[PDB]
Structures are given as C-alpha cells and as structure tokens.
C-alpha cells in the first residue's frame, strides 16, 4: 500500500463532474474544482485544469494526471508549512501517508489547525492523538474515512486498508 492507493480508496474515481460530501463540484480522484454553486463555473475550472474543452467529462489518464499533481502539491504544502513540517519529519513512512491524506482532504490550513493532535503525534502518543483527532467536525462528518486514517495513525500499519 502507498499514498496513491490509499487516497484512491478514500476518494474513489469518477470521470464526470460530481458533488463531494460538502456538496462542492469535484472530478476524478477527489479533485475539487470550485466551491461555487455554479456548474458553469465548475466546467470552466475543469477545462482550464485539463487544457481542453471537456464538457464536464475526462478520461482516466487525465484523472490520474490531476491526482499526481494534487498529491505532489499536498506534500509540498506540508513541507512548506512551519507547523506541519516538523511533524511530518518526525513520523515514520506509514504515518506520513496519514498526514498527506488529511491535507489532501482538508488543506494545509485545516490540518494545521489541529494543534493539539499535532503535538501528540510529534510526541508519539498514539492513543492520545487518536482520541483528540476524533473530536472534530472531520470525524463527525466523514466518520468511516476518518476512522481509517485515525487507526492507521494509531497502529502504524496498513491494516484498516485491508
Ligand atoms: Cl489544476
Ligand atoms: Cl467517510
């Protein structure tokens, strides 16, 4: 298992514009297009991302390409963030993939707001961090996915992902 397979499981793959769990227009592997209510704005953002007139539909390769770019950006966002970097560097490989998933889902900004959990993960207090991460809107809005990431931060193995 690796970060790409992990996020492919959590996000799914859809080739036509769709609405995510917060109702925002998305495509592919969890690639958010816009928070605007307009489908037309969504379609415009998609053509601009792909470089062609897609008419709201993309191919598998194109979805994979947006995915590679989004994973890369997530990593780089983490490495550039002063609150995130130290955590990420203190973690083992499996757990670093956990932090990339949260950032891919909720943004740098969002993850960096989990100050207390961050401090517990940096200290390697696994069960404590797991309990604090669950006290969040993230856990209450997407519990199945949050449970998989939290269990992975707790055990350091890929078991939750079968
Ligand atoms: Cl893009
Ligand atoms: Cl979920």
From Swiss-Prot:
Task: Name the reaction it catalyses.
Answer: Hydrolysis of (1->4)-beta-linkages between N-acetylmuramic acid and N-acetyl-D-glucosamine residues in a peptidoglycan and between N-acetyl-D-glucosamine residues in chitodextrins
State the organism of origin: Enterobacteria phage T4
Which one of the record's GO molecular function terms can you name?
A: lysozyme activity
Where is the major localization of this protein?
Answer: host cell
PANTHER family linked: T4-TYPE LYSOZYME 1-RELATED
Look up what happens after changing residue 20 to A/N/S/T. Answer: Complete loss of enzymatic activity
Q: What is the effect of changing residue 11 to Q?
A: Complete loss of activity
The family this protein is said to belong to: Belongs to the glycosyl hydrolase 24 family.
Instruction: Please convey what the UniProt record notes about how activity depends on pH.
Output: Optimum pH is 7.3.
Listed name of the protein: Endolysin
